[PDB]
Amino acid sequence: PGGGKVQIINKKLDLSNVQSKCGSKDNIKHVPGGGSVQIVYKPVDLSKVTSKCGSLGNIHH
Amino acid sequence: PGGGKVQIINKKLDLSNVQSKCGSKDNIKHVPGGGSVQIVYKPVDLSKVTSKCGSLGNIHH
Amino acid sequence: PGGGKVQIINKKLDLSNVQSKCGSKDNIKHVPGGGSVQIVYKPVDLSKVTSKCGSLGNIHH
């Protein structure tokens, strides 16, 4: 079974305001290997995010 | 089984205000590998996100 | 089983404001190896993120 190609030109400029930031929780992702087997068995997200702010954005006074 | 070609030119400029930000929770994603097998068995998302804010956007005084 | 190709030109400029930042929690990711086997069995995320802030963004006087 034939191998494929993945290419990712991820070009990012980030000037954002975030209180709490988490990355992805993807299970199976970017598989160009031919005849390969990926299993994710009973993956669970029970995570808790609590965020409190008075004010968040920019002023530009 | 022939392998495919995946290409992503993700070009992102981010100036946003976000209180709580979480990435994707995709199960199977971008599989160019020919004859490969991807199995996500019983994935569960029970995560809790709580967000509280006084004010969030920009002022531009 | 044929091996594939993965290439990532990650070009990130980051000037953002973040209180709490967590990386990704992806299970299986970027597999160019042909005939390889990846198994993630019962992965669980029980993490607790608590974030409190007075003010978060930029002033730009």
Residue numbers in the entry:
A (entry chain B), B (entry chain C), C (entry chain A): 270 to 330
Publication text:
Abundant filamentous inclusions of tau are characteristic of more than 20 neurodegenerative diseases that are collectively termed tauopathies. Tau filaments consist of a structured core made mostly of the repeat domain, with less structured N- and C-terminal regions forming the fuzzy coat. Here, we report in vitro assembly conditions with recombinant tau that replicate the structures of filaments from both Alzheimer’s disease (AD) and chronic traumatic encephalopathy (CTE), as determined by cryo-EM.
We found that reducing the shaking speed from 700 to 200 rpm was important for the formation of filaments with the AD fold by tau (297–391). To show that this was not only the case for tau (297–391), we assembled tau (258–391) and tau (297–394) with a shaking speed of 700 rpm. When assembling tau (258–391) at 700 rpm, we observed protofilaments with partial similarity to the GGT fold. The structures were nearly identical at residues 288–322, with an all-atom r.m.s.d. of 1.5 Å, (filament type 38a). It is possible that the absence of a non-proteinaceous co-factor, which was hypothesised to be present inside the GGT fold, precluded formation of bona fide GGT filaments. Further experiments are needed to identify the co-factor of GGT. With the exception of the reconstruction for filament type 47a, which showed backbone oxygen atoms indicative of a right-handed filament, all reconstructions of filaments with previously unobserved protofilament folds with resolutions beyond 2.9 Å (i.e. filament types 12a, 27a 38a, 40a, 44a, 45a, and 47a) showed backbone oxygen densities indicative of left-handed filaments.
